[PDB]
Amino acid sequence: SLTDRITAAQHSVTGSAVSKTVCKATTHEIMGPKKKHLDYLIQCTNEMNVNIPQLADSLFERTTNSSWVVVFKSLITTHHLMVYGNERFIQYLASRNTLFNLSNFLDKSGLQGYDMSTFIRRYSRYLNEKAVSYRQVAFDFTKVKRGADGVMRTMNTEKLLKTVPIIQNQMDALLDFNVNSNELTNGVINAAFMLLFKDAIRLFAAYNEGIINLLEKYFDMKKNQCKEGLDIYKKFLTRMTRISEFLKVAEQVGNLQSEVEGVKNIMTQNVERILARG
């Protein structure tokens, strides 16, 4: 039967089809991964007959390429699957103990490759942290129910104190991408930035809701919990200027206006409440 399952697998073309599509999503063409290939891979993540770790292996493999174009596109494809694919994909990445290792990545083929290597390294760290965040709390901050009956707003004190700093780590990694509007000049980096922006808006909301919950609980916590809360407030306050810059860039490059306005509004409201306590 194990022998049967193996022989069956040696006659299956599923894995090979998946790998070929990963290659098509990550060609040397300087454009975002094509929608048709991303869609096919999304459907793959819905298929129980698809080997998810093998699909992930193919994406990691493409990140060993020397070309920034191939590497960046593999990161983008991975991100796209984490966001739009079956949740078992990000769940699987969260379960791995080795993720992307692109901290030394440097393509020297020309100025474009050189400039893009910096963003590849930052983006890779963000995707690693996105997986790690899921691993640490066992859910995706950008997917959970929001509002007063939502996850972040209803979380109990002890969990809340452990959870907000994880949101803060994922946020920091996202904010470290740090691209200027005049650097968004090719389809590859633009595709990555669109996904980052989508994550960011949802992440900012989760962060704000965590802060709101803390503010509501503040007068009812133990003393050591208050200390941790204060540490959370202080870190919230110090990232405001970096968050403001992020939203500014997103607007320069063009709900967009609205979703950003609500982030500015709730964040401003939170700042005011925090400063009023101090």
Give the domain-ending residue among 93, 120, 142: 142
Last residue of a domain, one of 142, 173, 208: 142
- Alpha carbon of residue 45 to chain centroid: 18
Q: Resolution of the deposited coordinates, in angstroms?
A: 2.0
- The residue written with tokens 């399952």 in the block is 5
Q: What angle do CA 231, 236, 237 make, to 5 degrees?
A: 100
Are 260 and 250 in contact, with CB atoms under 8 Å apart?
yes
Do both 98 and 169 map to the same domain? no
Q: Which residues contact 118 (CB under 8 A, 6 or more apart)?
A: none
User: CB-based contacts of 14: which residues, under 8 Å, 6+ apart?
Assistant: 49, 50, 51
Both 98 and 148 in a single domain? no
Specify whether 166 is located in the same domain as 117: no
d(C-alpha 119, C-alpha 113), whole Å: 10
Q: How was this structure determined?
A: X-ray
Residue 125 and residue 189 in one domain:
no
Q: How many domains does the chain have?
A: 2
List the domain range (segments joined by +) for residue 179.
143-278
